[PDB]
Design a protein around this nucleic acid. Structure first.
Lengths: 73, 105, 90, 72, 246, 50
RNA sequence: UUUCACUCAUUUCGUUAAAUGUUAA
RNA sequence: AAGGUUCCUAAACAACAUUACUUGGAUUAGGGUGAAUCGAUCCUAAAUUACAGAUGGAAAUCCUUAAGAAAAGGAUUGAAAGGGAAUAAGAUUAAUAGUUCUUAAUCAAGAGAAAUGGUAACAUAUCAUGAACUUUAAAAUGGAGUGUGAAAAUCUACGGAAGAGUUCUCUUUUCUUCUUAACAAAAGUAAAUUCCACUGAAAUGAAUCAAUCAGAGAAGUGGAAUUUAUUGGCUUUGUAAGAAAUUCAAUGAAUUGUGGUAUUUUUGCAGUCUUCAUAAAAAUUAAAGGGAAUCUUUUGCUCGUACUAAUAACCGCAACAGGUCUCCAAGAAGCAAAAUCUUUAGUUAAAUAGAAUAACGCAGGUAAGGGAAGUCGGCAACAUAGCUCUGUAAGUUAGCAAGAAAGAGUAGCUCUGGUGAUUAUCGAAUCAGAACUUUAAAGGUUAGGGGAAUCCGACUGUUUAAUAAAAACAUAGCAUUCUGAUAAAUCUAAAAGGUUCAUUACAGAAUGUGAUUUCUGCCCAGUGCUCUG
RNA sequence: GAUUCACGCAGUGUUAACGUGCAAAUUACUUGUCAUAUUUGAGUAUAGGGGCGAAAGACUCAUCGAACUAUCUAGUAGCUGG
């Protein structure tokens, strides 16, 4: 697994056509946007709610989105 | 304390059978296989360990980047900088002496 | 520390006074440092029987088994130098 | 300790199954079969071993083809 | 009787040489035109310890007088050689320690080592530690020179036999007294199986001709003819003399 | 042993297959004397020596 | 028959069978 | 390794496990072993075996690259402990799991006039061309001892959360849980070593537990590199809390800090010591010198994989007190991996029991007074036993004897002082001393009897498996003999055959004596050996 | 190739136990030893007038002052038994 640092790369990754799945996890302090690509599982630790919403709109509707919470699926 | 067992079927404390015991979720301890300690490179003349090149297994050098298996210099990776400096002076001073000694003295 | 058994006190009391005497002279000269013929430093120490290495000088010299230069091996170098000079001159 | 105690370390086979005769007579270190005389081209037979001849010879097996020819 | 220990030595089963960590064959390089009519220069890369022998070995590196590459040789060190030294082999080589010269060019009285008994056979005589041979005289009529072997014997060789000037390194090795049985055990690490030697008188009559009776003694003279068969040739052979020398 | 050659393992398997008794129906054949297999063996009784 | 001189069988060697011998330069 | 279905389950108990058995490693019938990443397969070591050639009456033997129109250079085999491309955590089965499942990775083979920076050491998500040929390095190198970095375990400091135990006597109490992988990232921050630049050291300095180093250049300041169980060593981060552990409720909820100038283990590093010991090779990989030429995706085959590994699965006729190679390793106490007791795990059965409590036994003990008077002989048993301090002879190879011999102290409780770190706070077991008390103190366990002489062997070592462990053998030291290598010794029927010999007289081969000190007397007739006669 | 303890190992003594044994050589205590001439696994080499032996005629599959196995062989017996 790899970790992306700032906001610019994740959108470029999201807009890239190499995506396969997206899973969003909400923790007691932050929100993680794990993007499942072909090779790696990129993740992004987000602590700003407004910036998280911007990310959620950036997700193409065709891809499958999994929401994870205190109870695992 | 938690006691462990060999995971592979080797049962002797050989050089290639080294292990490390690390902790794991639930308090259990698991067994890893650690790599052998390797030597680096040596100057072709003075036999000193070269700087700038890691001490890894021979095959792992191919995995490294092209710039990470050598030093950007003449005879880089096979001769130390001191080894190289003596080479240049020998090649220049002896040749210059040959022009004065012989070759229209 | 010791009256007279200096280096051969590690042999204790079990090899004969005469044998411990002979081995003392050889072991003292085998473990001492010698003047290095190329850099004039007391930095030559034996590595193996017949091989001597200059520590702070980076040279390997072939020599005697326990001494850097043997008496027989020193006169020979003198003899060859005289022979070479006579041959080179007429 | 030449009796009971010395037999503790007997865990290294000397002979394994041969390929030409099927018996456990292939010497590993000698690289030969003690019974049928392997790689030696001829089958190992001795006139002092008259019984060993009648244990493995012509007619002691299937005779898959020879039985047809002689009857022919 | 049995077969004695000297008989079992000639079969070479456990008496084979323990030569696994040895460096190799130590000898001059093969003769060629450039050694017959010129000089080839070699570089003493390093001095190494060869197991089983008391003299150090030099890893000389000549270049390649006829092709491209290196000619890694393996000489026997002469006393005084050092790493990085240049040595010259050939008929025109200077008379310096470590140089290889034909035995005819050496002035009478020169001390040489690693001499070839026959031209081009790459060294026979004077190869142990501290040993050397002296040139006695020349004979230009039949191209022969006389040398004095380290045993004192005089030998006549052809004047073009090669030899190295100097003294084999590591002299004075045997003057240090072994003190312990264990030390002698380690001496034969890279040699043959000979060390713990049982006296013939301590054996039995089947084992040895000396194997005695109710008193440990020989019984018959220990000086024997050279023609005795293997098996009874035990002791002094063809002894011209016995007893302490005066 | 845990480690074995392929051919050796198959010869082990046959010895397992041959360590069986007479089926009941074969015992009811007319003029049948083969009631028990006298070539049988067990691991702790006789070592098959292979 | 002895003593010689040679090599040509023969012996013992060495190499990548890598300038041997004689002229020539 | 060896065994070979003994593994799991069900039915069943005729036989077997010296009684019995509803039990079983026993009977009957089913089920069970999943790999691109672990091994074999690949490479070579000691060694082994072919065609042709040589030898032999023959069978067959030799040779292993030398003899060959064979093989740029030398053929086959030889390691489940040597070398080696690449996988981990959780869950799952009556039984398989680095092999299955979920998640997350890695590796190999494929498919879609040619660069900058730094003074320098050197540095740059593939970048930034690099053929023949040649070289260098890695794979790939003994052992001892000291110091030290890091991780884990144990112990402990502060702060807690949940559960459990004790509770008429107290105990803010005692115990349990508080975790995290492969592979990668680079907030923060280490120890050690080696180099680079400036400068030039004497009034010589720098440094370690020890060393060791310097005008072929120290110390100082500023840098570069490598190592530290994967990336880059440790904390931290992604994986990742969604798992797992501890609780609670009836599937759903809670928590998952920070440290230590403590001990052990593991793993590296640094120098020091030691050898008449110098402590493997190849497959395979990279770099250099030279200048010839102009991210996505597919596939990863064959074989092993069950179980025991032993006071019941192996070898001894067997469920035999014998034997058989390894990995992991808690607390007390102590110098100690010792004896003794306990926690996690395992087991209470391992060739039958009950009653009575005779003789004679086997094993463990004690004993008045005397103390070897017993006996071939102090055989057996008794006795000494730790640590500290004082003290220690003759003899001697001057190293030892020596723990010589001999004497005193030692418990519990309440205190006092010495030995540091950091800059008032914090921390370590160690030593010394003083009052008081008692049953006067190493002793539960562990734990030398000592002295005066004589003989033999110098010593450490080895030895008649199964009646001899020794004064016997070995040993170092001393001495003698032969041999210049086409030799000496010596195996073979023979041999471009073989061993010492990858050797060369400081060597090879054959013998006697047995450290050191002192000394080895006379005899060459006899028998050997020899002569340059 | 110093002195000792421990894991181990050996076999000095009791000439203890057992001696139709746990065992065709073991058990208990005592004793010694317990890393460099050390201990040990696998592979490999050496074969019967041969090997191997720090030497006891020791070891060479419970067999060694000449192994095991088969043929000559129903070897011969002035000797014993029937």
């Amino acid at each position: 697994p790899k970790q992306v640092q700032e906001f610019k790369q994740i959108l470029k990754l999201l807009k890239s056509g190499s995506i396969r799945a997206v899973r969003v996890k909400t923790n007691g302090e932050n929100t993680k946007f794990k993007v499942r690509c072909a090779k790696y599982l990129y993740t992004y630790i987000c602590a700003d709610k407004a910036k998280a919403e911007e990310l959620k709109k950036a997700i193409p509707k065709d891809i499958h989105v999994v929401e994870i919470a205190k109870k695992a699926p | 304390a938690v006691r462990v067992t060999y995971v592979r079927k080797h049962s002797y404390n050989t050089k290639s059978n080294g292990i490390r015991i690390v902790k794991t979720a639930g308090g259990n301890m698991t067994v890893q296989h650690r790599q052998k300690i390797s030597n680096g490179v040596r100057c072709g003349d003075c036999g000193c360990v070269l700087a700038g090149i890691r001490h890894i297994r021979p095959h792992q050098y191919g995995w490294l980047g092209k710039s990470k298996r050598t030093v950007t210099r003449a005879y880089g990776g096979v001769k130390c900088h001191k080894c190289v400096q003596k080479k240049i002076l020998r090649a220049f001073l002896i040749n210059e002496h040959n022009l004065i000694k012989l070759a229209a003295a | 520390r010791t009256k007279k058994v200096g280096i051969v006190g590690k042999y204790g009391t079990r090899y004969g006074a005469s044998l411990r005497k002979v081995i003392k002279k050889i072991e003292i000269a085998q473990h001492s440092k010698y003047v290095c013929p190329f850099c004039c430093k007391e930095a030559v120490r034996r590595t193996a029987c017949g091989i001597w290495e200059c520590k702070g000088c980076g040279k390997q010299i072939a020599g005697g088994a326990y001494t850097l230069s043997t008496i027989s091996g020193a006169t020979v170098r003198s003899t060859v130098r005289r022979l070479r000079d006579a041959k080179n001159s007429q | 300790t030449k009796g009971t105690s010395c037999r503790g370390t007997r865990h290294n086979k000397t002979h394994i199954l041969c390929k030409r005769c099927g018996k456990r007579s292939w010497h590993l270190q000698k690289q030969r079969c003690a019974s049928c005389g392997y790689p030696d081209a001829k089958m190992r037979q001795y006139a002092w071993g008259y019984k060993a001849l009648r244990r493995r010879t012509q007619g002691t097996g299937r005779m898959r083809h020879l039985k047809i020819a002689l009857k022919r | 009787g049995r077969r004695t220990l000297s008989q079992r030595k000639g079969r070479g089963s456990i008496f084979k040489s323990r030569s696994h960590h040895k460096l190799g064959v130590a000898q001059h390089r093969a003769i060629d035109f450039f050694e017959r009519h010129s000089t080839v220069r070699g570089l003493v890369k390093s001095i190494e310890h060869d197991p089983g022998r008391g003299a150090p070995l030099a890893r000389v590196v000549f270049r390649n007088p006829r092709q491209y590459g290196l000619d890694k040789e393996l000489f026997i060190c002469a006393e005084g050689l050092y790493s990085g030294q240049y040595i010259y082999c050939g008929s025109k080589a200077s008379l310096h320690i470590g140089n290889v010269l034909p035995i005819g060019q050496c002035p009478e009285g020169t001390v040489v080592c690693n001499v070839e008994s026959k031209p081009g056979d790459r060294g026979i005589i004077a190869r142990a530690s501290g040993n050397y041979a002296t040139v006695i005289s020349h004979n230009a009529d039949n191209e022969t020179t006389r040398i004095r072997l380290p045993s004192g014997a005089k030998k006549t060789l052809k004047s073009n036999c090669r030899a190295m000037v100097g003294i084999i390194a590591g002299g004075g090795r045997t003057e240090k007294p072994i003190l312990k049985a264990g030390v002698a055990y380690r001496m034969y690490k890279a040699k043959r199986t000979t060390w713990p030697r049982v006296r013939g008188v301590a054996m039995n009559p089947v084992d040895h001709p000396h194997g005695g009776g109710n008193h440990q003694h020989v019984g018959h003279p220990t000086t024997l003819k050279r023609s005795s068969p293997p098996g009874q040739k035990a002791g002094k052979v063809a002894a011209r003399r016995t007893g302490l020398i005066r | 042993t845990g480690h074995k050659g392929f051919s050796y393992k198959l010869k082990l398997g046959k010895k397992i297959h041959q360590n069986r008794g007479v089926p009941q129906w074969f015992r009811m054949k007319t003029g049948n004397t083969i009631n028990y297999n006298f070539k049988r063996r067990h691991w702790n009784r006789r070592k098959m020596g292979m």
